[PDB]
Amino acid sequence: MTIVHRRLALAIGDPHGIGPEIALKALQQLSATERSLIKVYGPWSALEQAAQICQMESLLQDLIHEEAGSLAQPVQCGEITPQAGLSTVQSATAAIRACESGEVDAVIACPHHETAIHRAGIAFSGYPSLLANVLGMNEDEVFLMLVGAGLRIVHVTLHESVRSALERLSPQLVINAVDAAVQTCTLLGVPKPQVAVFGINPHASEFGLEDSQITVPAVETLRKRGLTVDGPMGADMVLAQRKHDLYVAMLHDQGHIPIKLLAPNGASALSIGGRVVLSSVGHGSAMDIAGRGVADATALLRTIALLGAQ
Amino acid sequence: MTIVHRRLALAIGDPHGIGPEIALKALQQLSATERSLIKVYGPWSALEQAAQICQMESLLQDLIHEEAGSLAQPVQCGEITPQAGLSTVQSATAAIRACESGEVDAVIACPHHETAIHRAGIAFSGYPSLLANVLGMNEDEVFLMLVGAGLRIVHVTLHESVRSALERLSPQLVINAVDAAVQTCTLLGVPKPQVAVFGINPHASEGQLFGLEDSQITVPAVETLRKRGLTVDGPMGADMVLAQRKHDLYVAMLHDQGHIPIKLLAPNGASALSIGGRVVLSSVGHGSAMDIAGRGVADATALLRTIALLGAQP
Numbered sequence: 001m002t003i004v005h006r007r008l009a010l011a012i013g014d015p016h017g018i019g020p021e022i023a024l025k026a027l028q029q030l031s032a033t034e035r036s037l038i039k040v041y042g043p044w045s046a047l048e049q050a051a052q053i054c055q056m057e058s059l060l061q062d063l064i065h066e067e068a069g070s071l072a073q074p075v076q077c078g079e080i081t082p083q084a085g086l087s088t089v090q091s092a093t094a095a096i097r098a099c100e101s102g103e104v105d106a107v108i109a110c111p112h113h114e115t116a117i118h119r120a121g122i123a124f125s126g127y128p129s130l131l132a133n134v135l136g137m138n139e140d141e142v143f144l145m146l147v148g149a150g151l152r153i154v155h156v157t158l159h160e161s162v163r164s165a166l167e168r169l170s171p172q173l174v175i176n177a178v179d180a181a182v183q184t185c186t187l188l189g190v191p192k193p194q195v196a197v198f199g200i201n202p203h204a205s206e207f208g209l210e211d212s213q214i215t216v217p218a219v220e221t222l223r224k225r226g227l228t229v230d231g232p233m234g235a236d237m238v239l240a241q242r243k244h245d246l247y248v249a250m251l252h253d254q255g256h257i258p259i260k261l262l263a264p265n266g267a268s269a270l271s272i273g274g275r276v277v278l279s280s281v282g283h284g285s286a287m288d289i290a291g292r293g294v295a296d297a298t299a300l301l302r303t304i305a306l307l308g309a310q
Numbered sequence: 311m312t313i314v315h316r317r318l319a320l321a322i323g324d325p326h327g328i329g330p331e332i333a334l335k336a337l338q339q340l341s342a343t344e345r346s347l348i349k350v351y352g353p354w355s356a357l358e359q360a361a362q363i364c365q366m367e368s369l370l371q372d373l374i375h376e377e378a379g380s381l382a383q384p385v386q387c388g389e390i391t392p393q394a395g396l397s398t399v400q401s402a403t404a405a406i407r408a409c410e411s412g413e414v415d416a417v418i419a420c421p422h423h424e425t426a427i428h429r430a431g432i433a434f435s436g437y438p439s440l441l442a443n444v445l446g447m448n449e450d451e452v453f454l455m456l457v458g459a460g461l462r463i464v465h466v467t468l469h470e471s472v473r474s475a476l477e478r479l480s481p482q483l484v485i486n487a488v489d490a491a492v493q494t495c496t497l498l499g500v501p502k503p504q505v506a507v508f509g510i511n512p513h514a515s516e517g518q519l520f521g522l523e524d525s526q527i528t529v530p531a532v533e534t535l536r537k538r539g540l541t542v543d544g545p546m547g548a549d550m551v552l553a554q555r556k557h558d559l560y561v562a563m564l565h566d567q568g569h570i571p572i573k574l575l576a577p578n579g580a581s582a583l584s585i586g587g588r589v590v591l592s593s594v595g596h597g598s599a600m601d602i603a604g605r606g607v608a609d610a611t612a613l614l615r616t617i618a619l620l621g622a623q624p
């Protein structure tokens with residue numbers, strides 16, 4: 001079973017965490033041809049360390065690697081350090097830039113440690129903010145798509161009060177979300193996606209003017225551009241039908257609830273802006289087991305299978 | 311075995327619809343003792359008609375019945391008529407009043423037809439509004455609880471714009487919703503539930519990082535409920551709490567927060583309880599089915615399921 005069919009960047013995350021170890025364990029499971037499609041971004045010293053502990057030194061010769069987030073001192077597994085935090089952001093930044101320039105088609109970031117990044121004096125509020133910052137766009141133009149249990153749901157807004165989200169919603173914002181999400185769908189192996197747009201208000205207002213001002217004009221424009229788009233519709237109703245390859249959530253909770261319920265441990269979070277698709281694996285850096293050789297690479301392999309489709 | 315363990319009122323709905331027919335088919339499946347706990351409200355003429363079509367005349371002689379929503383003309387199955395609309399509201403009103411007075415412990419309303427009611431000149435926007443109107447309370451003090459697939463979710467607000475819902479949210483509104491929902495839980499066979507309150511904003515505002523609403527509304531409300539001795543968690547992010555699945559009752563601030571989980575897990579299976587004062591009123595999960603009324607082919611499964619839910623052992 002080949003799971004990688006396109007070029008991918010893998011940023012190895014916090015070099016003191018389990019990110020290095022799971023990168024190797026993942027790459028080990030792949031064939032030689034698959035390995036050559038994955039470019040690893042991170043400090044060599046950490047990959048060396050993990051390879052020694054896990055006894056996978058012979059794998060290192062086959063890795064395609066680019067030095068990023070170099071360390072000035074030896075790797076200290078399990079230790080939260082500002083240096084490690086800087087490393088994480090640099091590795092991820094270099095992967096993103098490689099996707100931006102067309103060297104790879106998508107990026108996977110191994111687990112970061114939020115405290116490490118903060119201690120380096122780096123502002124970080126998630127991959128959507130980082131991706132925007134690196135690509136030099138506004139946070140408004142990078143969207144989060146959750147993928148889990150068959151469902152794909154792009155969020156037009158995220159991480160702000162409901163009132164604040166309502167004030168920012170516009171037809172253009174919804175259109176930009178869908179364009180970004182449709183291009184990502186192509187990458188996930190769905191060329192002609194059937195799109196469903198959630199209503200802002202219950203039953204898509206059939207209960208306020210917001211949908212007539214926002215979601216209705218947006219769907220009209222998308223359809224004129226030749227997209228197959230239904231809605232606005234009541235979130236609850238459309239989801240239940242299970243007739244669509246992509247759903248467009250207006251609000252955080254509309255999109256987050258379905259995914260956490262159906263896919264408690266199988267959900268991917270894709271950050272999407274410009275040409276770039278960045279997934280995390282859905283777990284932390286596990287400092288209590290780092291350097292002890294007990295980390296499993298299942299979540300990383302799942303992320304690779306999803307982004308590596310075709 | 312027994313699915314009915316307390317007294318219920320059954321309002322038979324639009325008498326031209328399938329409501330009469332499914333009431334009989336349901337009662338047929340129950341034992342004699344169970345049948346004697348269900349008091350049927352509606353026009354006798356419609357039950358007679360349905361009994362003839364379904365060949366259940368001998369069942370009618372056992373039925374506990376109160377005349378409500380009498381008709382002035384023969385039943386015309388399948389036909390939308392104002393008279394039928396008036397009938398529906400009268401039957402349902404009489405069942406509600408029987409629950410209000412303590413004659414029954416809960417109410418089931420069989421399917422109505424919205425057009426019929428409107429043509430009778432009667433304002434109707436759902437059972438929450440009717441229940442409020444009959445009990446003489448405001449629509450703000452009657453709440454909708456969805457039940458399906460182990461989930462129970464009461465909605466603090468319901469069928470209104472998000473903006474409108476946000477403007478009405480207050481600590482007291484949240485408290486009233488929970489009180490109503492807790493008393494209903496007792497009736498559903500879970501006394502003293504473990505309650506989870508959803509946040510208004512994502513992540514329950516994460517303190518105050520994503521708006522002040524939760525600090526002003528859900529936090530003081532939970533504090534008050536806990537001081538009164540209730541086991542209540544939150545506010546928490548809706549998505550997060552639901553995923554845990556370790557609470558008997560959830561409190562949704564907004565329509566979609568509560569409706570999405572239920573339709574996902576229980577695509578058909580979900581009951582909608584209107585709760586006001588001491589009265590709990592469920593619908594059956596379907597319409598009056600005018601196209602098949604009076605042909606004897608309607609399924610009673612949804613009614614039986616509603617009876618099992620409201621009829622549960624204390």
Ligand SMILES: NC(=O)c1ccc[n+]([C@@H]2O[C@H](COP(=O)([O-])OP(=O)(O)OC[C@H]3O[C@@H](n4cnc5c(N)ncnc54)[C@H](O)[C@@H]3O)[C@@H](O)[C@H]2O)c1
Pocket residue numbers: 328332421422423424595596597598599600601602607608609610612
């Ligand atoms: N309560 C109401 O508001 C109500 C009732 C009847 C009709 N209507 C009007 O007609 C539309 C559709 O309503 P509907 O009556 O078709 O119901 P529905 O949408 O709830 O159910 C779909 C169809 O399934 C069948 N069905 C439903 N319950 C059944 C049962 N117990 N046994 C066998 N078959 C059953 C009927 O043919 C029904 O038409 C509504 O959108 C409305 O405009 C409304």
Ligand SMILES: [Cl-]
Pocket residue numbers: 007008036037038039064
């Ligand atoms: Cl490559």
Ligand code: NA
Pocket residue numbers: 114115118
């Ligand atoms: Na911190």
Ligand SMILES: [Zn+2]
Pocket residue numbers: 159252512513
């Ligand atoms: Zn979130």
Ligand SMILES: [Zn+2]
Pocket residue numbers: 469569
């Ligand atoms: Zn509804």
